[PDB]
From Swiss-Prot, chain B:
Effect of residue 3 to A: Linear IpCa; Loss of stimulation of [3H]ryanodine binding to RYR1
Disulfide topology: 3-17, 10-21, 16-32
Record protein name field: Imperacalcin
SUPFAM superfamilies: omega toxin-like
Site (Important for stimulation of [3H]ryanodine binding to RYR1): 6, 11, 30
Result after altering residue 7 to A: 97.51-fold decrease of stimulation of [3H]ryanodine binding to RYR1
Pfam families in UniProt: Toxin_27
Organism the protein comes from: Pandinus imperator (Emperor scorpion)
Region span, Essential for stimulation of [3H]ryanodine binding to RYR1: 22-24
GO molecular function, one term: calcium channel inhibitor activity
Curated annotation (Swiss-Prot), chain C:
Protein name, entry field: Ryanodine receptor 1
Tissues of expression: Detected in skeletal muscle (at protein level). Fast- or slow-twitch skeletal muscle.
The organism's taxonomic lineage, starting at the top: Eukaryota, Metazoa, Chordata, Craniata, Vertebrata
Domain of life: Eukaryota
Lumenal side: 8-27
Motif Selectivity filter boundaries: 2-8
Gene encoding the protein: RYR1
Additional note from the record: Binding of [3H]ryanodine indicates that the heterozygous channel is activated by Ca(2+) concentrations 4-fold lower than normal. Single-cell analysis of cotransfected cells shows a significantly increased resting cytoplasmic Ca(2+) level and a significantly reduced luminal Ca(2+) level.
Subcellular location: Sarcoplasmic reticulum membrane
Length: 19, 33, 49
């Protein structure tokens, strides 16, 4: 359980939502 | 003319009397239904 | 299996590479059962239809 993958997935989701 | 028979091989949505050109799965030849 | 290879494989929660193995199982399920098997089944069913 590492937070780096969660941060990357959240950033990708936010980027695709904004676009 | 624009309207097509029931199970005639149609071309796109509408363009038929049944007005629904749905395809029954992973294949071509959309037909009115 | 119907739910990916992870059903028979041991749980990686208690071992290393947990996130990597979880991603591997998820992508295996998605790219095998959801996509390829469904495509084959749709091919057969739509051929019959």
């Amino acid at each position: 359980t590492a937070r780096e993958a969660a941060t990357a997935l959240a950033a990708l989701l936010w980027a695709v939502v904004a676009r | 003319g624009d309207c097509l028979p029931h199970l005639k091989r149609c071309k796109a949505d509408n363009d038929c009397c049944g007005k629904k050109c749905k395809r029954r799965g992973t294949n071509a030849e959309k037909r009115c239904r | 299996a119907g739910g990916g290879i992870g059903d028979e494989i041991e749980d990686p929660a208690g071992d290393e590479y947990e996130l990597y193995r979880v991603v591997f199982d998820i992508t295996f399920f998605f790219f095998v059962i959801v996509i390829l098997l469904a495509i084959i089944q749709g091919l057969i069913i739509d051929a019959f239809g």
